[PDB]
Amino acid sequence: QVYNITWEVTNGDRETVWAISGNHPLWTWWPVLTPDLCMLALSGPPHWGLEYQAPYSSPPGPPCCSGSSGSSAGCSRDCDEPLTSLTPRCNTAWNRLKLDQVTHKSSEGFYVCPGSHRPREAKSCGGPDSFYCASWGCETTGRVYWKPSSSWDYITVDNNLTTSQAVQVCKDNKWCNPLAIQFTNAGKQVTSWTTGHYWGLRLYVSGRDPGLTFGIRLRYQNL
Amino acid sequence: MLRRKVVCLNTYDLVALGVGSTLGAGVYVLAGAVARENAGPAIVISFLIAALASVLAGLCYGEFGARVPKTGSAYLYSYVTVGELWAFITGWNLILSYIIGTSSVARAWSATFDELIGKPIGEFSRQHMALNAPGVLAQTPDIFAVIIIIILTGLLTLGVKESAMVNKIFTCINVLVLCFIVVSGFVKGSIKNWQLTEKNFSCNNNDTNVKYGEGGFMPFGFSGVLSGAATCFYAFVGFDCIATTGEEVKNPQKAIPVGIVASLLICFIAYFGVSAALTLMMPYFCLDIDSPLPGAFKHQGWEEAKYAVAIGSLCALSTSLLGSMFPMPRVIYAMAEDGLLFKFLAKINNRTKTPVIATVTSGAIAAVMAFLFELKDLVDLMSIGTLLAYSLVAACVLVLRYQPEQPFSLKSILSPKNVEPSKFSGLIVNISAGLLAALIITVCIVAVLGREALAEGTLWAVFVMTGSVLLCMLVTGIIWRQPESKTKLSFKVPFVPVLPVLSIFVNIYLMMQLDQGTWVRFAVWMLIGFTIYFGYGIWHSEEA
Ligand SMILES: *[C@@H]1O[C@H](CO[C@@H]2O[C@@H](C)[C@@H](O)[C@@H](O)[C@@H]2O)[C@@H](O[C@@H]2O[C@H](CO)[C@@H](O[C@@H]3O[C@H](CO)[C@@H](O)[C@H](O[C@H]4O[C@H](CO)[C@@H](O)[C@H](O)[C@@H]4O)[C@@H]3O)[C@H](O)[C@H]2NC(C)=O)[C@H](O)[C@H]1NC(C)=O
Ligand SMILES: *[C@@H]1O[C@H](CO)[C@@H](O[C@@H]2O[C@H](CO)[C@@H](O[C@@H]3O[C@H](CO)[C@@H](O)[C@H](O)[C@@H]3O)[C@H](O)[C@H]2NC(C)=O)[C@H](O)[C@H]1NC(C)=O
Ligand SMILES: CC(C)CCC[C@@H](C)[C@H]1CC[C@H]2[C@@H]3CC=C4C[C@@H](OC(=O)CCC(=O)O)CC[C@]4(C)[C@H]3CC[C@]12C
Ligand SMILES: CC(C)CCC[C@@H](C)[C@H]1CC[C@H]2[C@@H]3CC=C4C[C@@H](OC(=O)CCC(=O)O)CC[C@]4(C)[C@H]3CC[C@]12C
Ligand SMILES: *[C@@H]1O[C@H](CO)[C@@H](O[C@@H]2O[C@H](CO)[C@@H](O)[C@H](O)[C@H]2NC(C)=O)[C@H](O)[C@H]1NC(C)=O
Ligand SMILES: NCCC[C@H](N)C(=O)O
């Protein structure tokens, strides 16, 4: 029978930060989840600058007056100035531009490691404190030069928008780091999405390699 | 082209002279600009770096003036010790330093005075003048700076000299105002302005195109801090007057280095305190473009203090302005008499007993530079030349420490058996100094132009960086193994194999931090200097 299925993407605190709904039969609808990388960081680790931001909160930071809205009192010209000295994070539009650059650069990017749903043989990968990426080889997906892949991980994560597409979205002071999460086959045959599964996404940069924890889950009701 | 020439104030007096010639025009005007654009609240660190380098340079001068009995500018010492071409380059860089310093301090003085009286002169200039070259030339031509330069050049031509009493009075007023600024910053200012975040990225005014950066203590990163340090190096320039002072010194070669170092330390303390105050009272991105300190005082409600500051600045700037003007004709006259510059510039006029032609020409050049270019551009153009001159002096000290007194096998070079410098050792040190200078230039090029490449860890950038650094260490060791000249000196650089090399490296790095336009202006100026030397300097040299 048809249910009003809903796919929910949540931060590390298990609070719903994004969702997509539709009337479909159960275990037959597998849409491409498109949550923005910053929503996952809402109320997340301090690095992203959204530790005090509730889910569904508006993007923080003053607007770029390169943006469509035009020049306004208090605009940030950082969005035009070089991004080399900025930190990849989500607390400002120019920091989001730097995050997009890091997430799109070939020499850089992000990698995702599975959480509790990983096999016991992967238990050496560490817990949430390590974002399940304690050592190389634990990452199963994400966008980097070596293109990690897994035949058992439930999802694959890529960038939904190219740098050119995302730059103007960032300059508009909107959420502008949309991930594209596609259920792998192994995810599709799996039915434990009701309990929810979790992953750790870490930036592949020089230094901290800061990361966050996100999760995917399924809800349904009669309709 | 290396012909070599044949050659009371207390410590407190020299300290006062240096402080008066250094404090103004770098803390009252450019501190806010650096804190807003380059450094942020981390400008305090910038002033530290610019301080340390300055100190190093000063220490070199302490040795560099110790080797020559006749006190004078670094040009005189170079021309006596090392040769003619090197001395010409040093004197040309000092001429640039003095001219552009006069131009920049006149700009700062005119801007401060005009702002004090409500900016009527700026409105007049915008109404009746326009350069139509926004990308290079100044938006507003400073006619009042030209008037100031004309008046001061007229005074200097008539024979007005350094009034030590007036300098002391103005320096005391300046230091009192700076102490007031520091105390008011620590009373009204708060540390929260050093911890700003995206919540506070909103200036209460309606300014546009604001640079908020990361926020916190280091919004623009250590690259921004380094650019701010390169800009603030201008603030520490002026201690040369200690060594070049016309008045006889009680203990010249002992008081000059101590005086220079003490003046630099006092200036660093003042700059640190005042910049910390400025960035604590008001947000770095909120700092006023025209009047940063008065703007910060008004922001916290103490608008009346703007008058007090308006006094101190107008004192400091004055003491700085003359500090840039008095040496300006002296170096030109010295170079013209020696034949390196046009001989007519050396014509002392009988009516005044002063180098009238040199003073007039230098004043006109400074007035034009102040008319055409912005304060920041002039500051950078002066900083690059002063950095080159200080690097030249440090190289002179390093080379001369190992040269023999005025009249091969790898093991021999590595381990010279001679107890005292031989001509072979002197040639080895000269070659090592040249190689080390080129290698340091390469390192700075890789560390700036290839900065992102090094951050990316590309094979070529890292390879060149490691090779250049290790070879710099190797050449420094080569110089180290050479015996030092036993000629006793009243003052010496403590670590002669390392300290001059570090001074050169820091100076060249700071020059690399400067913008492309500054480098183009410096290149054309050096082209003019080389044209003058090769066309006229070599043939009309007095020692030829
Ligand atoms: C099919 O089911 C979806 C999902 O319902 C939600 O999830 C279920 C698991 C269950 O917990 C439900 O109780 C829960 O609502 C239905 O979509 C929801 O529709 C309602 C009706 O408007 C939305 O109500 C909210 O109303 C707010 C007004 O104060 C408004 O601000 C909200 O918009 C903002 O917040 C939501 C989430 O809070 C966010 O998704 C928006 O983008 C926006 O920021 C919102 O309108 C629920 O929020 C909806 N839940 C969603 C979208 O997840 C859907 O109606 C249902 N279909 C049928 C036919 O019944
Ligand atoms: C994430 O990626 C998806 C897919 O690349 C983006 O969806 C795309 O959005 C654009 C604009 O919203 C759609 O273009 C539209 O096409 C319709 C015809 O279908 C046309 O009438 C409109 O005028 C417009 O040109 C595009 O079709 C759509 N693609 C898909 C596959 O749905 C999405 O915008 C990206 N961002 C986010 C936050 O999801
Ligand atoms: C139509 C004109 C007159 C407009 C009004 C401007 C003048 C009244 C101002 C502009 C610059 C001023 C001068 C700027 C600097 C100084 C140096 C100052 O002396 C020192 O600072 C001594 C310290 C040292 O010698 O280092 C004495 C005042 C004086 C001549 C100022 C006197 C008043 C001047 C000429
Ligand atoms: C006065 C005597 C007793 C001590 C002299 C010490 C100096 C030789 C040291 C102290 C601090 C040093 C500086 C500290 C930091 C740097 C930054 C460094 O560059 C970077 O780290 C760039 C990093 C980036 O790319 O972000 C280049 C050397 C420099 C200027 C150093 C040069 C040498 C300095 C001036
Ligand atoms: C920057 O903004 C933050 C957030 O508004 C300010 O912090 C708050 O300041 C108010 C003062 O009115 C306090 O009542 C709150 O308790 C503060 N909250 C937090 C989380 O700090 C901060 O003061 C602002 N900084 C400046 C320099 O104005
Ligand atoms: N008086 C010499 C010119 C440079 C000086 N440090 C200044 O701040 O202007």
Side-chain angles (χ1 to χ4, degrees), chain A residues 1-119 121-122 124-222, chain B residues 1-135 137-246 248-249 251-253 255-352 354-405 407 409-410 412-544:
Chain A
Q1 184 176 2
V2 172
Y3 310 112
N4 175 27
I5 304 298
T6 309
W7 279 105
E8 295 194 306
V9 178
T10 66
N11 56 13
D13 296 12
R14 292 180 179 90
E15 308 174 308
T16 306
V17 296
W18 180 90
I20 188 172
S21 311
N23 283 297
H24 294 83
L26 193 65
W27 313 129
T28 72
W29 184 47
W30 306 97
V32 65
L33 315 179
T34 53
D36 173 48
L37 175 58
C38 296
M39 310 189 170
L40 315 181
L42 290 166
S43 294
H47 164 78
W48 307 98
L50 310 180
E51 61 271 62
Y52 307 128
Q53 299 295 130
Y56 303 100
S57 61
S58 303
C64 319
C65 62
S66 291
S68 58
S69 303
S71 292
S72 64
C75 75
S76 183
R77 96 166 184 253
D78 291 280
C79 314
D80 304 341
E81 292 276 60
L83 307 164
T84 59
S85 67
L86 297 178
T87 295
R89 61 185 192 205
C90 290
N91 72 322
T92 64
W94 52 98
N95 283 120
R96 284 190 298 274
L97 277 162
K98 177 59 165 169
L99 176 59
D100 187 59
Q101 173 176 314
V102 166
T103 298
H104 274 119
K105 264 180 70 70
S106 305
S107 179
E108 268 162 327
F110 71 95
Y111 54 94
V112 185
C113 313
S116 59
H117 68 280
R118 76 196 168 190
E121 181 275 359
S124 61
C125 290
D129 53 13
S130 66
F131 309 116
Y132 316 105
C133 310
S135 61
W136 274 29
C138 290
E139 81 276 10
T140 53
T141 183
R143 204 211 61 51
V144 295
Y145 70 84
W146 71 90
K147 305 182 101 93
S149 67
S150 174
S151 61
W152 56 267
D153 195 12
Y154 305 162
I155 64 155
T156 61
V157 190
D158 189 45
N159 297 317
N160 191 64
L161 298 179
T162 61
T163 308
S164 58
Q165 301 163 271
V167 159
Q168 209 51 52
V169 183
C170 301
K171 286 180 174 179
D172 283 28
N173 206 24
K174 293 187 286 184
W175 288 131
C176 71
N177 310 100
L179 302 182
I181 307 154
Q182 293 144 260
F183 300 93
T184 64
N185 297 75
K188 303 212 208 83
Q189 294 83 18
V190 165
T191 187
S192 54
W193 296 101
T194 67
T195 73
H197 301 133
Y198 304 81
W199 291 260
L201 179 151
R202 300 189 70 157
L203 302 184
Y204 176 63
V205 296
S206 46
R208 178 52 37 69
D209 291 331
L212 55 81
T213 299
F214 77 91
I216 297 165
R217 84 171 150 260
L218 180 139
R219 295 290 185 268
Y220 63 100
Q221 59 207 61
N222 316 118
Chain B
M1 324 194 169
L2 71 173
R3 287 184 287 235
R4 303 183 192 221
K5 202 192 165 206
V6 177
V7 68
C8 58
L9 303 196
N10 202 358
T11 305
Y12 303 168
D13 299 302
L14 301 173
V15 167
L17 206 57
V19 171
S21 302
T22 301
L23 273 181
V27 66
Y28 283 108
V29 185
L30 290 151
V34 171
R36 185 180 60 254
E37 313 294 5
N38 298 116
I43 185 173
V44 304
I45 298 179
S46 297
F47 277 117
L48 177 62
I49 294 164
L52 291 165
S54 301
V55 166
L56 294 167
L59 288 169
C60 293
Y61 264 71
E63 186 150 329
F64 188 59
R67 290 186 171 285
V68 176
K70 202 160 73 90
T71 49
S73 66
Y75 159 70
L76 187 154
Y77 303 150
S78 303
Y79 195 24
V80 162
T81 59
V82 292
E84 190 150 280
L85 171 56
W86 184 258
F88 174 88
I89 300 165
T90 304
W92 196 246
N93 274 272
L94 290 183
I95 285 165
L96 184 77
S97 188
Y98 296 136
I99 286 175
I100 308 300
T102 296
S103 306
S104 54
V105 181
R107 182 65 60 85
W109 203 103
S110 170
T112 302
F113 180 83
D114 194 39
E115 169 265 318
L116 166 55
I117 58 154
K119 297 185 288 295
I121 308 178
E123 309 265 22
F124 173 110
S125 172
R126 285 175 284 169
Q127 179 180 14
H128 288 147
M129 306 164 171
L131 299 181
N132 298 336
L137 301 190
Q139 298 186 357
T140 60
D142 197 337
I143 183 61
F144 185 51
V146 169
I147 293 294
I148 293 160
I149 288 164
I150 286 170
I151 289 163
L152 294 187
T153 54
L155 298 184
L156 266 67
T157 312
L158 271 43
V160 176
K161 292 194 280 264
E162 187 84 74
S163 296
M165 193 55 112
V166 184
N167 193 292
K168 280 174 179 177
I169 292 161
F170 284 12
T171 301
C172 286
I173 294 163
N174 181 6
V175 168
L176 183 61
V177 169
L178 295 165
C179 288
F180 159 73
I181 290 159
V182 174
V183 172
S184 59
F186 280 6
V187 168
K188 300 292 288 180
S190 66
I191 197 69
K192 304 202 141 293
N193 285 310
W194 285 14
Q195 302 173 355
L196 301 166
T197 62
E198 80 277 350
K199 324 192 161 283
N200 318 103
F201 289 175
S202 171
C203 49
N204 286 310
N205 63 42
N206 60 5
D207 183 48
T208 305
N209 290 16
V210 177
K211 199 168 61 176
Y212 303 100
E214 301 275 90
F217 175 80
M218 200 175 293
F220 311 126
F222 201 78
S223 58
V225 173
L226 285 165
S227 309
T231 309
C232 285
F233 174 85
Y234 168 93
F236 289 100
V237 174
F239 61 82
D240 308 65
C241 295
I242 292 166
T244 307
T245 292
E248 203 204 0
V249 173
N251 191 2
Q253 298 183 350
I256 283 164
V258 185
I260 285 168
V261 174
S263 301
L264 285 170
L265 297 193
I266 290 162
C267 288
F268 165 63
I269 290 161
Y271 296 167
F272 186 99
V274 169
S275 62
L278 177 66
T279 56
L280 287 165
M281 312 195 42
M282 190 172 202
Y284 61 94
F285 51 83
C286 285
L287 298 177
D288 190 348
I289 297 169
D290 291 331
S291 54
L293 273 164
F297 273 110
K298 178 170 171 57
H299 172 275
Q300 299 289 32
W302 286 7
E303 183 176 337
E304 292 78 353
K306 77 189 178 181
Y307 293 113
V309 179
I311 291 159
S313 59
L314 287 186
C315 288
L317 293 161
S318 303
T319 61
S320 179
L321 178 46
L322 290 160
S324 303
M325 291 193 78
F326 281 124
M328 182 179 72
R330 297 181 190 154
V331 180
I332 293 167
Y333 165 78
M335 293 178 72
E337 171 86 20
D338 285 7
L340 313 193
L341 292 183
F342 306 109
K343 284 300 308 191
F344 75 86
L345 292 165
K347 172 144 91 66
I348 282 184
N349 164 277
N350 301 59
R351 304 175 182 163
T352 64
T354 61
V356 171
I357 313 306
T359 306
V360 168
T361 302
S362 55
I365 298 163
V368 170
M369 291 301 324
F371 191 77
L372 292 174
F373 293 80
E374 290 293 346
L375 177 60
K376 184 63 69 68
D377 286 307
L378 296 165
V379 162
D380 290 348
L381 181 60
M382 195 218 80
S383 300
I384 195 166
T386 309
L387 285 160
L388 183 61
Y390 292 171
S391 307
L392 295 193
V393 169
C396 285
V397 168
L398 177 66
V399 160
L400 294 175
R401 186 74 80 89
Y402 298 89
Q403 299 312 300
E405 285 77 9
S409 86
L410 181 68
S412 164
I413 301 151
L414 295 173
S415 60
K417 320 311 293 165
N418 63 6
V419 178
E420 89 292 340
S422 61
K423 94 182 301 173
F424 183 63
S425 179
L427 174 62
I428 288 284
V429 174
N430 292 351
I431 292 162
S432 298
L435 272 73
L436 200 44
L439 207 62
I440 281 165
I441 290 161
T442 303
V443 167
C444 294
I445 282 167
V446 176
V448 175
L449 283 72
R451 190 264 308 293
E452 287 82 39
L454 285 177
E456 193 156 56
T458 192
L459 62 84
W460 200 48
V462 173
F463 159 62
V464 176
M465 174 53 67
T466 187
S468 305
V469 172
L470 269 57
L471 186 61
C472 278
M473 271 175 79
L474 176 57
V475 174
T476 303
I478 296 282
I479 295 170
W480 200 316
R481 295 292 296 157
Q482 304 317 304
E484 321 194 9
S485 61
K486 285 286 179 284
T487 285
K488 204 43 181 73
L489 292 173
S490 44
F491 184 86
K492 288 183 183 177
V493 176
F495 313 119
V496 67
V498 181
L499 188 154
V501 176
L502 293 181
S503 181
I504 293 157
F505 164 70
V506 173
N507 290 349
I508 292 172
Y509 194 72
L510 292 183
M511 311 175 58
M512 289 303 158
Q513 304 310 305
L514 300 177
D515 296 2
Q516 183 177 2
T518 292
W519 275 96
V520 170
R521 293 168 204 136
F522 189 53
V524 65
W525 174 257
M526 291 301 325
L527 191 143
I528 292 161
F530 284 125
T531 304
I532 291 161
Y533 182 66
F534 293 129
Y536 186 99
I538 208 74
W539 319 112
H540 287 102
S541 168
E542 199 65 43
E543 296 297 308

